[model samples]
Target: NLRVLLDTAIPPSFCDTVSSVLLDDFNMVSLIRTSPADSLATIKQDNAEIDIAITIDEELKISRFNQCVLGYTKAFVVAHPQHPLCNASLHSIASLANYRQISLGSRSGQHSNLLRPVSDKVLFVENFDDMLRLVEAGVGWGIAPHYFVEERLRNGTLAVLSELYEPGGIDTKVYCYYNTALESERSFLRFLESARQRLRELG
Candidate 1:
């Protein structure tokens, strides 16, 4: 059996395609789609944890995994259209300290992790939807995935804060992970390769 942990950022439609390929081409005995939290748990249970499981960053770290796939949109900061800082350019993470910030709690999220080093003056929110609501109410600015906020931006409810120090535009890498010790893991490996090729075709 092969178990994979993937991020929720991936579209279910795309994941369905990949799952079908894995089952039909690789003869995978089982496949499971799980949240990042449960996926991390699976990795720990099987002793198959790898660092490149999701996205890579400026830190050139490597895991035992054979490959890393680059996916997901660049993350960015968004603010209410009428906010004064909406037009100001933020060149560094430190620049955000001067303004109020809203984020997705203190969990293991991209926005929270990225800003943790400089979040002493930032406010925290428990949910992305709430963060958007706050942004609409002119409470504080927040960071979010571009895809998640596209409609809000188009409707003039939210605007990009700055291009500098944004998360997604950087050379981040996401990957599939497996344990190298299993001799019968060829099926999982083939599925990963096929999935990578499909992503390349789309890219």
Candidate 2:
């Protein structure tokens, strides 16, 4: 049995179950545990804490990476069960600025929403799961991934007014990066290929 238990750090709760597709469900015996989004990937260079990292980043692109369009998730502008806008006669994304929106961003420590001219008072958060919590708590309306909030949608805690929120969904990509200095060419390429293949298999 390959009992090498590995820790993974994908995009928080927004990600599909990587361990399932990558190991056990795929018939590999290794155990896997996941961590928060920003932890492993931030101080990645401190070799004292070696890590096989997989999280969201761009400036980290300086490292050798085998990138691909991993998979897609549907994100939507969602609101509480009794939000006022749900009653209002809203028109289009062009008209969204009149309303405040909670935005989700990828920066490790700093939380903020994605860029748009919609509102001067956009709220920010670290990731999807937290965003859903706030939106369900009646904090403000914001976009959410369908997978993360499928239960809420079914239970009526959160709802998406696709009738008003035009093109009410967005697709996202996952990238896989590895340090060449740490992994040899053969093993590194094999690792990227496996990671990419498993993620697609997940989709």
Candidate 3:
């Protein structure tokens, strides 16, 4: 059995396609799903429980011995249309004190450690979907992956907060990791290559 622990930012539709490809092209019995935080600890404990793991960057690649697939979009912040600061230029993290903040909650099944610096200022919601809903309802602003908030931003339901406050540049990497011993697993290797090709086409 092949297991793929993926990121929530990857659209469900894309995931469905990958699942079909894995079964149809590779004839592999595979399960693809998002991971919970505790699962991270469990995976760390067993080390071999995950046939494949997906992470964001090279830094995460250091501890594990496996191949990596680079993928992901720039992360950004968004605010409801009615928010007072939506159109102004926000240049620093301290400026965020002027507004109420909403964030991904612990039970939201997302990795909140990514937002650690601003955690104290955020009102954690149960999930990304819920955070988006609350933002649309004018609850406050949020930090999220571009892919997850792109549509709403385009529709004017949400607006990107001042770019000046963006501490990180617009870029992120997605990596796929697997055990070096099993790296020769034909089906798994092929699927990884196929995913790379698809992402390149998207680029």
Candidate 4:
């Protein structure tokens, strides 16, 4: 059995393709949805339990597992259409310090410079959907992938702070880390290639 902890950032279609393509090769491929931080912690604490982790690289320095760079995605600061910051005269990263921030996961001090919390009032959640919904519902501002909120951004539901800031978006790498020792190296390679193809198509 190959238990895979997949990051929620990766689309479900990618997982479906992986499951279907490897159906005949493996008896069971168990998949779990989690943030990259939790995925890394789970793999570190119980090395033999999970065979693979599909996650985004938030500068997560890895050494032990075999790693693969799937692709890059753009992330930007997002706010609700009616949020005060959207219409504020002073638009800057420093301006964001006034509003509450919606953050991902619980490891507060570990956030990278790109998604660093600027506000004193921070709300942490485990998944992306909640963050998106909160921002859309005027709870607070948050960081979101461009593609994830593409339609909303265009439809004027979600507004990007980058529209006012000079340099707006940051690049995030989608990555996969696998312990080859847990499974056949050949199969892992095959799965990685297939995942890359699916991700490319997704883009």
Candidate 5:
């Protein structure tokens, strides 16, 4: 069976579509949800642990896996409804310096996603959902893909803070990585490429 580890950053809706195509056509693939840290390393792993890793790790050399752009995503910061700065008018990333910020750790176990050190206290979590729960519990403010917090936003538990917009929002591309070593990876690769093309066409 094809061992595929999908990054959680991938939308379940899109994954479901590609999964349907994989199941109907390829008929021999296993998909697993990858941890947030591994999303940046699996392509470079180049070993048996992962045959494919869907990610946004553009830093890897092109010689890594057969990488493809899946779609675009935006990153923004958020705060809790009851936070002290909830209603503050912020216009700079530097303004976030005083707050306790929550971010994700990379495969190297390092805090990531911050372009510059802004927070006095930064908490690094293993997954996105855990970060959400922390932000909801007033642990700290965090940055995440907008879609991940839609329901919480609607319920007023989370609010997109003016921080990212203050500096400028982060634009990113979702990507897919196929094993460099392949015997017959055609059907699976074609599905991902088609899905990316379809998404771009729709947008």
Candidate 6:
């Protein structure tokens, strides 16, 4: 059996996909969501409790664990379709400073927010759901994973406020980190391959 820790930033759909992919061995695995700090701490301690983790690569050192690159996704600066910025033709990250912005709290880590807020007037939220709720209500514009806002963008509920960064400059790359001491059994190896295939098929 394996204990798995998930990053809160991961999308609900993606979580469901993982569950579905691992269904054959689902009974042998247990999953929980927690902060990246705790996840890293668990792996660092060489404890057998947490066998693996799936989280975004925050440019952190992962020398302690065996890392598997899952896939990459983009981040988008988004706002309600009715937002004032939506009608403006010009778009730039610097322009965001003129309006209020939504921010992800620091508990997730410095790079958790994905994009740094240029505006001084910021509303901090604990998770993506909270940040998304506020953005949907027109409270303020915020940055989110493209997968999280894809449907909203398609339905015209949310509009892209800015690209924020040039292509290839900054992207969210999810990784599967496992305990170094644990040997990858057939089940664990299959889970990793399944996850990689699923994520690639998504793109």
For 1-203, candidate 3 gives per-residue lDDT tens digits of: 66666556555555654676678544445564443222343334464466665644233442445756545557677778777776546443456665667764433344535543353466766456777888788787776677778788778888776476545435666666665766666766677777777766765
Winning candidate number (TM-score): 5
Weakest lDDT window of 10 consecutive positions for candidate 5:
109-118
lDDT of 2: 0.51
lDDT of 6 by residue, 1-203 (tens): 66777777576667876777777776777888854334454455555467778777453566556876777666778898888888535564566888888876655345333344568888977677788899999999987777678888888888886543544223667778877765446767777778878877876
TM-score, candidate number 4: 0.78
- Sort by TM-score, top down from the best: 5, 4, 3, 6, 1, 2
lDDT of 1 by residue, 1-203 (tens): 44445554444544664666656644434445443323333344435433223322222332334444535445557888888776555543456676677755534444323434244556666546777899888887876655568789889988776566543333334545545553256655566667676766765
* lDDT: worst 10-residue window of model 1: 51-60
Q: Flag clash pairs in model 4.
A: none
Query: Total clashes, candidate 5?
Result: 0
Clashes of 2: 2
Model 4 Cα lDDT, one tens digit per residue, 122-179 = 8887767889889899999987666678788888889877654535476677767777
Candidate 2, residue 151: Cα displacement in angstroms equals 0.6
The TM-score between candidate 1 and the true structure equals 0.66
List per-candidate RMSD values in Å.
Answer: 4.9, 5.7, 3.9, 3.4, 3.3, 3.8
Q: Model-by-model lDDT, in order?
A: 0.55, 0.51, 0.60, 0.71, 0.68, 0.70
Q: Please list the residue runs of candidate 4 whose C-alpha ends up more than 4 Å from where it truly belongs after superposition.
A: 58-64, 87-90, 107-116, 146-148, 163-169, 182-184
Comparison by TM-score, 3 against 6, better one: 3
True-structure lDDT of candidate 3: 0.60
Name the runs in model 3 displaced over 4 angstroms: 13-17, 24-28, 35-42, 45-48, 57-67, 92-94, 107-113, 117-119, 165-169
**Pairing residues by index, what is the TM-score of model 3?**
0.74
Instruction: List, residue by residue over 1-203, the lDDT tens digit for candidate 5.
Output: 77776767666766675676667656578888765556655545556456666665555454546776778766668788888777657443456787888877665664335322367798877788888889998998887766687678889888767544545446767767666775256776577767777766655
RMSD of 3: 3.9
Model 5 residue 27 lDDT score: 58
